[PDB]
Amino acid sequence: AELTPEVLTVPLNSEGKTITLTEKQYLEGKRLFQYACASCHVGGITKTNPSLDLRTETLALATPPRDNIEGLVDYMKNPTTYDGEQEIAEVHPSLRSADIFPKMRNLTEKDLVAIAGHILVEPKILGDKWGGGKVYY
Amino acid sequence: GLWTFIALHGAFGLIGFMLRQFEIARLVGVRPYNAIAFSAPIAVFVSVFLIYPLGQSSWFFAPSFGVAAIFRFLLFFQGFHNWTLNPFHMMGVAGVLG
Amino acid sequence: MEVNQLGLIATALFVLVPSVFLIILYVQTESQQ
Amino acid sequence: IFGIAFSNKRWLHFFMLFVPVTGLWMSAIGVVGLALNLRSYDFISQEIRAAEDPEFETFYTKNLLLNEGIRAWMAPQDQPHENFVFPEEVLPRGNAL
Amino acid sequence: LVNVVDEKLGTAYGEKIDLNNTNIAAFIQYRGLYPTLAKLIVKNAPYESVEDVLNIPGLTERQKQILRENLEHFTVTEVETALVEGGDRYNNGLYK
Amino acid sequence: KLGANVGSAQGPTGLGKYLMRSPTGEIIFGGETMRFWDFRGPWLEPLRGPNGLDLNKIKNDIQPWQERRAAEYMTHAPLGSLNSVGGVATEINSVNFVSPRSWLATSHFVLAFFFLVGHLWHAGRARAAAAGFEKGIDRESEPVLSMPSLD
Amino acid sequence: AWKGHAVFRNKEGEELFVRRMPAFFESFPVILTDKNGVVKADIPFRRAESKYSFEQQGVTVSFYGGELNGQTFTDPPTVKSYARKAIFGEIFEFDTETLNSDGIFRTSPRGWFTFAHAVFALLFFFGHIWHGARTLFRDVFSGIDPELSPEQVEWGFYQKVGDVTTR
Amino acid sequence: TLTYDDIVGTGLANKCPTLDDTARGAYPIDSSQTYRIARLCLQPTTFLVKEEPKNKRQEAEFVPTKLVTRETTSLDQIQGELKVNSDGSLTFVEEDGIDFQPVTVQMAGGERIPLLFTVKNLVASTQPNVTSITTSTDFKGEFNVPSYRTANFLDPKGRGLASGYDSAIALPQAKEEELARANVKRFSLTKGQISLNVAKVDGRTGEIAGTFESEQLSDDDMGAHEPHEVKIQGVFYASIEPA
Amino acid sequence: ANLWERFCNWVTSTDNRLYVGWFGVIMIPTLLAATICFVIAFIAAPPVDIDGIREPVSGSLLYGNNIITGAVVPSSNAIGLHFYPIWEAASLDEWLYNGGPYQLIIFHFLLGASCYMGRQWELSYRLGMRPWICVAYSAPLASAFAVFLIYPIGQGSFSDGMPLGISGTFNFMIVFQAEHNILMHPFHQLGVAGVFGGALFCAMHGSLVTSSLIRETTETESANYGYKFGQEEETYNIVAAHGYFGRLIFQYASFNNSRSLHFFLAAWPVVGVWFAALGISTMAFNLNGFNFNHSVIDAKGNVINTWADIINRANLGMEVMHERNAHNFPLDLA
Amino acid sequence: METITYVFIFACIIALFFFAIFFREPPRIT
Numbered sequence A: 001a002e003l004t005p006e007v008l009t010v011p012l013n014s015e016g017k018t019i020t021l022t023e024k025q026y027l028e029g030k031r032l033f034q035y036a037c038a039s040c041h042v043g044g045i046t047k048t049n050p051s052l053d054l055r056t057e058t059l060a061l062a063t064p065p066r067d068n069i070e071g072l073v074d075y076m077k078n079p080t081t082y083d084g085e086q087e088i089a090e091v092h093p094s095l096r097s098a099d100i101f102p103k104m105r106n107l108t109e110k111d112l113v114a115i116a117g118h119i120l121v122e123p124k125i126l127g128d129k130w131g132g133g134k135v136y137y
Numbered sequence B: 001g002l003w004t005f006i007a008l009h010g011a012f013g014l015i016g017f018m019l020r021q022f023e024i025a026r027l028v029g030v031r032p033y034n035a036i037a038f039s040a041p042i043a044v045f046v047s048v049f050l051i052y053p054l055g056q057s058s059w060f061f062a063p064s065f066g067v068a069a070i071f072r073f074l075l076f077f078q079g080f081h082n083w084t085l086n087p088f089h090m091m092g093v094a095g096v097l098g
Numbered sequence C: 001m002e003v004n005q006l007g008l009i010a011t012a013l014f015v016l017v018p019s020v021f022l023i024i025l026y027v028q029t030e031s032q033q
Numbered sequence D: 001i002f003g004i005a006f007s008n009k010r011w012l013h014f015f016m017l018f019v020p021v022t023g024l025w026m027s028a029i030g031v032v033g034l035a036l037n038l039r040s041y042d043f044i045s046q047e048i049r050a051a052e053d054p055e056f057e058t059f060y061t062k063n064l065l066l067n068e069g070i071r072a073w074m075a076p077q078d079q080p081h082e083n084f085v086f087p088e089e090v091l092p093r094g095n096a097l
Numbered sequence E: 001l002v003n004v005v006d007e008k009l010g011t012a013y014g015e016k017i018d019l020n021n022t023n024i025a026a027f028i029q030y031r032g033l034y035p036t037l038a039k040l041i042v043k044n045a046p047y048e049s050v051e052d053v054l055n056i057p058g059l060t061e062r063q064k065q066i067l068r069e070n071l072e073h074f075t076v077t078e079v080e081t082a083l084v085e086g087g088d089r090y091n092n093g094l095y096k
Numbered sequence F: 001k002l003g004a005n006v007g008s009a010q011g012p013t014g015l016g017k018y019l020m021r022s023p024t025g026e027i028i029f030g031g032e033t034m035r036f037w038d039f040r041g042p043w044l045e046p047l048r049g050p051n052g053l054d055l056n057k058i059k060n061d062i063q064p065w066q067e068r069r070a071a072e073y074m075t076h077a078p079l080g081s082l083n084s085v086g087g088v089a090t091e092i093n094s095v096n097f098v099s100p101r102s103w104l105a106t107s108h109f110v111l112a113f114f115f116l117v118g119h120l121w122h123a124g125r126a127r128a129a130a131a132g133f134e135k136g137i138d139r140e141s142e143p144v145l146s147m148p149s150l151d
Numbered sequence G: 001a002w003k004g005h006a007v008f009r010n011k012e013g014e015e016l017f018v019r020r021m022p023a024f025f026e027s028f029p030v031i032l033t034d035k036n037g038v039v040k041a042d043i044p045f046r047r048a049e050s051k052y053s054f055e056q057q058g059v060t061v062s063f064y065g066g067e068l069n070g071q072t073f074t075d076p077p078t079v080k081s082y083a084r085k086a087i088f089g090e091i092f093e094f095d096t097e098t099l100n101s102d103g104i105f106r107t108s109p110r111g112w113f114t115f116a117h118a119v120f121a122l123l124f125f126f127g128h129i130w131h132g133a134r135t136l137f138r139d140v141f142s143g144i145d146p147e148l149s150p151e152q153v154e155w156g157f158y159q160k161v162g163d164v165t166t167r
Numbered sequence H: 001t002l003t004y005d006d007i008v009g010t011g012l013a014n015k016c017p018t019l020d021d022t023a024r025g026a027y028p029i030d031s032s033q034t035y036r037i038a039r040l041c042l043q044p045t046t047f048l049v050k051e052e053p054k055n056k057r058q059e060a061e062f063v064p065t066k067l068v069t070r071e072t073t074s075l076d077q078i079q080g081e082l083k084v085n086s087d088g089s090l091t092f093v094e095e096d097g098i099d100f101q102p103v104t105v106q107m108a109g110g111e112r113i114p115l116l117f118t119v120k121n122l123v124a125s126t127q128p129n130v131t132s133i134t135t136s137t138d139f140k141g142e143f144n145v146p147s148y149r150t151a152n153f154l155d156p157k158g159r160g161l162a163s164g165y166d167s168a169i170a171l172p173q174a175k176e177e178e179l180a181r182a183n184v185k186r187f188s189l190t191k192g193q194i195s196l197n198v199a200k201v202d203g204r205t206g207e208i209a210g211t212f213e214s215e216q217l218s219d220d221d222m223g224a225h226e227p228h229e230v231k232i233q234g235v236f237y238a239s240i241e242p243a
Numbered sequence I: 001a002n003l004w005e006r007f008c009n010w011v012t013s014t015d016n017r018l019y020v021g022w023f024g025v026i027m028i029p030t031l032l033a034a035t036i037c038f039v040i041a042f043i044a045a046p047p048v049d050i051d052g053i054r055e056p057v058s059g060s061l062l063y064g065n066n067i068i069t070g071a072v073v074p075s076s077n078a079i080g081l082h083f084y085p086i087w088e089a090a091s092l093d094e095w096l097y098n099g100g101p102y103q104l105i106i107f108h109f110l111l112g113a114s115c116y117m118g119r120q121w122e123l124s125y126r127l128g129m130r131p132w133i134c135v136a137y138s139a140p141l142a143s144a145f146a147v148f149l150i151y152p153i154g155q156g157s158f159s160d161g162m163p164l165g166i167s168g169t170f171n172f173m174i175v176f177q178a179e180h181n182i183l184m185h186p187f188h189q190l191g192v193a194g195v196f197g198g199a200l201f202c203a204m205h206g207s208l209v210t211s212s213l214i215r216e217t218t219e220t221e222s223a224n225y226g227y228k229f230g231q232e233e234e235t236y237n238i239v240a241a242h243g244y245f246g247r248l249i250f251q252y253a254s255f256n257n258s259r260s261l262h263f264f265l266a267a268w269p270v271v272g273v274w275f276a277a278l279g280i281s282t283m284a285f286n287l288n289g290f291n292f293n294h295s296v297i298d299a300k301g302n303v304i305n306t307w308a309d310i311i312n313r314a315n316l317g318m319e320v321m322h323e324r325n326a327h328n329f330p331l332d333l334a
Numbered sequence J: 001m002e003t004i005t006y007v008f009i010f011a012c013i014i015a016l017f018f019f020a021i022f023f024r025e026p027p028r029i030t
Ligand code: CLA
Pocket: B040, B041, B042, B043, B044, B045, B047, B048, B073, B074, B075, B077, B078, B082, B083, B084, B089, B092, B093, B096, B097, D023, D024, D027, D028, D029, D031, I173, I195, I196
């Protein structure tokens, strides 16, 4: 098995347009994810709230949908609760709250795309392991 | 194949080493207590690497030759055999720490 | 506790038989000049 | 310091031979038992009492809970030929963990 | 002598979100319910029937629409003390 | 936030799931962390009243910066592997983290231990050297030989 | 007596098969699959996210042959009892009273014979070592020659080890 | 005014406020107004366990017990609505608070009795026509006593209600019937009764204090055994305020 | 000779059947306290709420334990590292419920044993010996400290100290593996080399010396009578033993100097056990064993399991089952 | 019964310590 273009092709938006990431984008996405996100989201779970994981099925049922690049990028700018009802920038790392989550200060647009890409691709690789928790370790 | 290769050549190797202890003891003129003492490593090797899997379904459950593999063997014996509870193990522990 | 009751005699003999063995050997050693 | 001491050197060095050699031989015997699964797994009296009496707990029963965890969580990956599929819901787990 | 939880699994509780008993994390399964409506719903339980969930005080029209869209996913069974005590509807000791 | 009354939530053991009393009555966090109730920190103290954690302050006065702080510290517990994989020993590779506190505490425990050993070594040697027998027993002057038998 | 063969089925009438206990395990979960090995039912540990409970899956058991021939049970506790027994293979009625049996498995004469003789074989290996040594080293049993020449044991003095004629 | 550092470790955190002995006043109830208990504090001082007779025809008595779980017993920060009824009686409805404490007391001979000392869902009322709370006002009420362990609790063999084994796995071929009471966990929900005798009133501050007596069942270990009857005596404090 | 001088002379007297000494003055009462409390508690102590969740664990013989399952149970998690002497309890019954005996015993014991070490130095000084036997003893001592004191300090509770019992010891080991992966810690591995090596060299030295005993006896008598206590001449031939072992391996892997040999015998297990003790003491601050969980990944990113990952599975079983009722939140951080 | 047995054996061992220490064969220099 290898990291093919097919694996690296992920939904861009909700209209069903796709984007194909480079291997470099994927790996950058992995590095940046480890940098800014993995302290809470290692393996696609959420340590400070295990009810919400990063499985693509979970992301698809978020409001607005987060199972595509645009949804995830927007989330990293302006995170909401799962039902979209509340803006949670003040307790969740985001560009909007880069003043209180300083690691977000040196993320660029292209970075947000890479991180989003990593989150979308990883479950295509790891299956149940992604968002599964210790049961699948 | 390398597992049986190593385990078997290893067995005969141990036999060879203890024969070596006897041979040299006899040539030099000392009593063969070193060989006799070496009976204990041979008992361990033979019981753990040969007899134990022979009692089980297959070689698969013998120890694998590696550091972490052996750790796994330990944890397996705790979980499946409750080996720490075994008074024969306890006597072994007493012998080694003693 | 529902222990095996034979344990009792098993333990008793386990202690007494070999211990007595030793004691016999020791005493007749002392009684030699 | 200790109450007793060696006084015989030959006996001392023999004893140094004797202790670890004998220990290893004993462990060997135990493993020969485990070849047949002839284990020292349980204390039957403990199990009868604990089965009847849900407030009876010892380090022995505690360790059995640990063993049960080890088996359930390591068996499928450790014994791939068995094809163990253990759904999440059957895995023994304490609260939260 | 019966385990009441096992028994409850043989009712609609083992098929759908039971407005009267089910832990709040379950509302994650459908769009729009978590956390806001889920909180409202668990707070205002128990309910005599599913459509009673539409009578919760304060609900916006949006929330009513979401609820209407999800009624088929909902059920109600008799409150089971074992499932609702301990605050277990909010946190039932299950994480990942 | 989800609507739990944390003050009255009975945990599985019968002890409060979130809150319980310390052995001297102070209101403290529950779970295993009951052991850590002596902890004081700037992010927690505003929730503290005369009797320990104050339930009304908990219900009304928890600020977002406190939630942030608690999440950060919880996800940076001083646990990690020797090759700097952060987390419990069963955590998968991902987070390159071992706390400075662990590095410092372990290093200095090791150092302190060996320096205690060095103290034993050199103190004992110093005594022996001063008294004149650090090179061994004088055969013709062996102290024990001039002592009565113990029995 | 044989209770007869237990056939488990689910609500959809699929035949299910209990995963048999491997000899390694003192205890074993109760798991039911279809012929293709797909998990279709089980006895859950945590109930709160159970998807395969006998109750959810409507698991029944029917018996063919044995004392329970022709009978079907549909109440979850009973069906579960029989599934628990089913991990042990065929199901039997036992008189547990006469001997005050404690419910815990014991090995057979095959087991005990094998154990005793493997152990005795191993110990007797040591016996062979000990007496073989005493036979071949009879001359040094009480100790070595007080007049052992240091040059017989030091290197190079003799060309052939132990052979004083090769100095 | 004492702070946390004044109190910590002293045992004072488990004590309820008392009122001065001068507090024999009266706190007027305006039947047109809605009232609230802002803090109800219950400090137990004695735990009595009903002894269980052999002949069952003699009288059972309450024996004293020894508290072994230290100063972890008081209920506090309990709050709820205080309603004036049609007949002038007042009804406290408990809403929330630290309204339970597991307690283990020990009987002579060594038997430990665990109980969930609680006033969960307390509803309590006074005599009719209480125009003022006074040192002759008293509340009588009922409360819920849930199972001392909740559904997730696992016994030492890993059996439980919402989790755990459903059999005695260490005895694989034992007859299950004899073990049913231990294998099948049950969650009890019972009722307790309580009397609050108001002994002190600060009509200025709306503060009342007094003594209480409660009766409830003890831990039945999830149906494994019969619970004991327990009578708890102690003192209480409450601050009333307009809501 | 006044009374204080007389007392000092008796205390430091090399004529007492058992040496007392100034360390002994602390050692004797502390060890007696620990010993008496331990025996009484092991037989008759009621169940102890070790983890502080009102779930008492039975440790004594009278309460359904045998020699193997019995223990003096660690003091309650609710106490943490608080000092819990008898007089801090409202009653003895309270004290017993909360596991006070554990604290009394381990504090008195650790004191007594430290003083045992000091006493070894002390008698060595009164006898005109070289001083370092105590340094050897510092290795098991440190170990005791590791499991009775340092580990609780780091984890914040004596409830996580080693229980005083056989099965309790096994519990502590298993849980330790779950939370620190001690097998994958090089200090534990050095410990294992220390005790395996120590045993090996014990049997080695025993057997070589025995093999080279000079003949002094007939076949019908014990060879041991060939040695007489206090004799000036060596009882075996170290040149013969050296010739033998040197041919067994090669010449330069055999000791010909008894001093340097015996020093090796001393040093190897002592250094090893020092490392084992440091292992426990540093894992007390959660600097844990090597973690190679999912270290090997294929071209696509599939996890390729190694033996490390199997170990992790077993570790997970331990972690999730241990103290099954004591955790409310998803991470077990101490 | 078991308890009595365990404590008995233990007690015998302690008695044995006493004798092995104070009523030992004296080491005699020769
Ligand atoms: C207090 C801690 C402790 C101690 C001191 C022991 C001690 C022992 N354990 Mg136990 N163990 C423990 C805790 C402990 N255990 C715990 C908590 C568990 C979990 C249940 C276990 C699980 C366990 C298992 C599964 C086994 C043991 C075994 C043993 C015995 C091994 C003897 C040996 O040296 O084999 C070492 C191996 C040999 C001596 C074989 C011969 C070796 C040859 C000579 C090597 C020659 C190699 C050559 C030089 C080449 C080197 C190449 C190089 C590159 C590597 C010994 C009595 C073993 C046993 O009982 O065997 C009968 C065993 O199988 N233990």
